[PDB]
């Protein structure tokens, strides 16, 4: 019954284009009767650094610190910092996780990279057995809503930036698919700073309109072929 | 005709494999007579978040905050946070910048992503126009020294992770090349955790051995063909 959505938002300005895309998502999904939660990373002063402060109590090896081993153990022993577990609860209950962010160096802003590094720990999002198709977050949907500085023409195979699917690889495949997420087609709003009002409105409207039927969408085939193939 | 090297290092543990690769680089480059500087991000508690705290002067637009616009202006006016300018000084003087880090979600750890986001600002690393082959850091060399959890086999075209070059795209092309850097071949030390003592010592020695002749190397053609073929 019903659907739960978590929006992980990474922009410093509420009045930004990203802020508007996040607000439109909240409005539309809320109108549909969906349960909606937003993790406004900058407003939360979310910690991006992976450090030993992410484990409470005593480390499984206070001699040599291995973040991966320590957090996996901490997860299984319920000894992770509360900011991390708070995010994990949101992800665990979510049916769909939308990431809203401006492209920073062909990737996500560092504060959001930190959310991924720290929240998607072994035991919670993946394990030796459960990864990719068997990812622990299988059954969940993920969607990247990104805005860019460069134009769509620049993001083509022969363009200066290469195809946008090229930079999506680490995020959609290396991260989301690895954790079991079914990946919905990305929403890319190209160069809003350069675009005109009519175009910007069209972009936000396209996002809102798309959200009207997001639950009918089928995941993309998150494969090397989709990202690089023909 | 000496050379200056900056190693941007991102690992929490001095006794780690990454720590050993960083130390081997310092040892060998120092032995060669090179000038060496290391930015130990975790030890420095380096700030990864791109926020308005990065600008100390009067904002160009105090109503709507745009990180790119404000940092570009702040760079020109010299009102950027000192931690950013401290890093820019190191980069400006360096002939070669080596990034030493463990792969985190097919990318760099968030603390290092933050270094890229905040240090490589407009006016310093690139201009518009003034990117890719016209980037402001032209004449400089960059090299990614990465360690992984996955094995070399997993990081091949037919591997579950796809070819290792795929995840290098956002970093080598979208970031380094965009800023004008000539990119030297990446050094990828695969699955040291699974490797045996002998195999690990071998990977470290291979890195040190390569550094002996690093100044005779040619950069790679940082193109889509190099990364994806086809
Ligand atoms: C460190 C850093 C690295 C970057 N790396 C890359 C990169 O690798 N590749 C790349 O392509 N780009 C890159 N960029 C560009 C960056 O992605 C863009 O600046 C950003 O995505 C633009 O959107 P943003 O600020 O929301 O837009 P705003 O600048 O917030 O949006 C543009 C305009 O939209 C208007 N607007 C807001 N709400 C609405 C609304 N509801 N309806 C209509 N208009 C509205 C605003 O007032 C504004 O004038 C980088 C930027 C930084 C700071
Ligand atoms: C949040 C997160 C995300 C990750 N994402 C990915 C991913 O997307 N893809 C992927 O492949 N991996 C991923 N990993 C795996 C991670 O990259 C590896 O754990 C790491 O790179 C291993 O190296 P590191 O800790 O130095 O190794 P250590 O664990 O530091 O090294 C392994 C062994 O090397 C030994 N050693 C150290 N120095 C020497 C020396 N001089 N001679 C001989 N032995 C030595 C150590 O004692 C240790 O037993 C991720 C990890 C985390 C925490
Ligand atoms: N419009 C573009 O060329 C552009 C602009 C910026 N800018 C203003 C912040 C960045 N970038 O910073 O990485 C990257 C690109 N990019 O396309 O590759
Ligand atoms: N050894 C591996 O399979 C491995 C381990 C991890 N781990 C421990 C953090 C990650 N990863 O998290 O993305 C990825 C891989 N990878 O190969 O694709
Ligand atoms: Zn995939
Ligand atoms: Zn390139
Ligand atoms: Zn390239």
From Swiss-Prot, chains A, B:
Record PTM Phosphoserine, positions in chain: 79, 196
Keyword Manganese included in the entry's annotation: no
Sample GO molecular function, one term: protein homodimerization activity
SUPFAM superfamilies on file: Flavoproteins
Pfam families: Flavodoxin_2
EC number per UniProt: 1.10.5.1
GO cellular component labels: cytosol; extracellular exosome; nucleoplasm
UniProt: FAD binding residues: 11, 17-20, 103-106, 147-150, 155, 193, 200
Cofactor(s) for this UniProt protein: Zn(2+); FAD
A single BP term in Gene Ontology: quinone catabolic process
Keyword hit for Phosphoprotein: yes
Residues that hold substrate according to the record: 126-128
Reactions catalysed: 1-(beta-D-ribofuranosyl)-1,4-dihydronicotinamide + a quinone + H(+) = beta-nicotinamide D-riboside + a quinol
Binding site for Zn(2+): 173, 177, 222
Activity regulation, short description: Inhibited by melatonin, resveratrol and 5-hydroxytryptamine.
UniProt KW keywords: Cytoplasm, FAD, Flavoprotein, Metal-binding, Oxidoreductase, Phosphoprotein, Zinc
Cofactor, how bound (note): Binds 1 zinc ion per subunit.
Subunit structure and binding partners: Homodimer.
Role, per record: The enzyme apparently serves as a quinone reductase in connection with conjugation reactions of hydroquinones involved in detoxification pathways as well as in biosynthetic processes such as the vitamin K-dependent gamma-carboxylation of glutamate residues in prothrombin synthesis.
Annotated family: Belongs to the NAD(P)H dehydrogenase (quinone) family.
More about this protein: Uses dihydronicotinamide riboside (NRH) rather than NAD(P)H as an electron donor.
Record-given protein name: Ribosyldihydronicotinamide dehydrogenase [quinone]
Protein source organism: Homo sapiens
Phylogenetic placement of the source organism: Eukaryota, Metazoa, Chordata, Craniata, Vertebrata
The gene coding this protein: NQO2
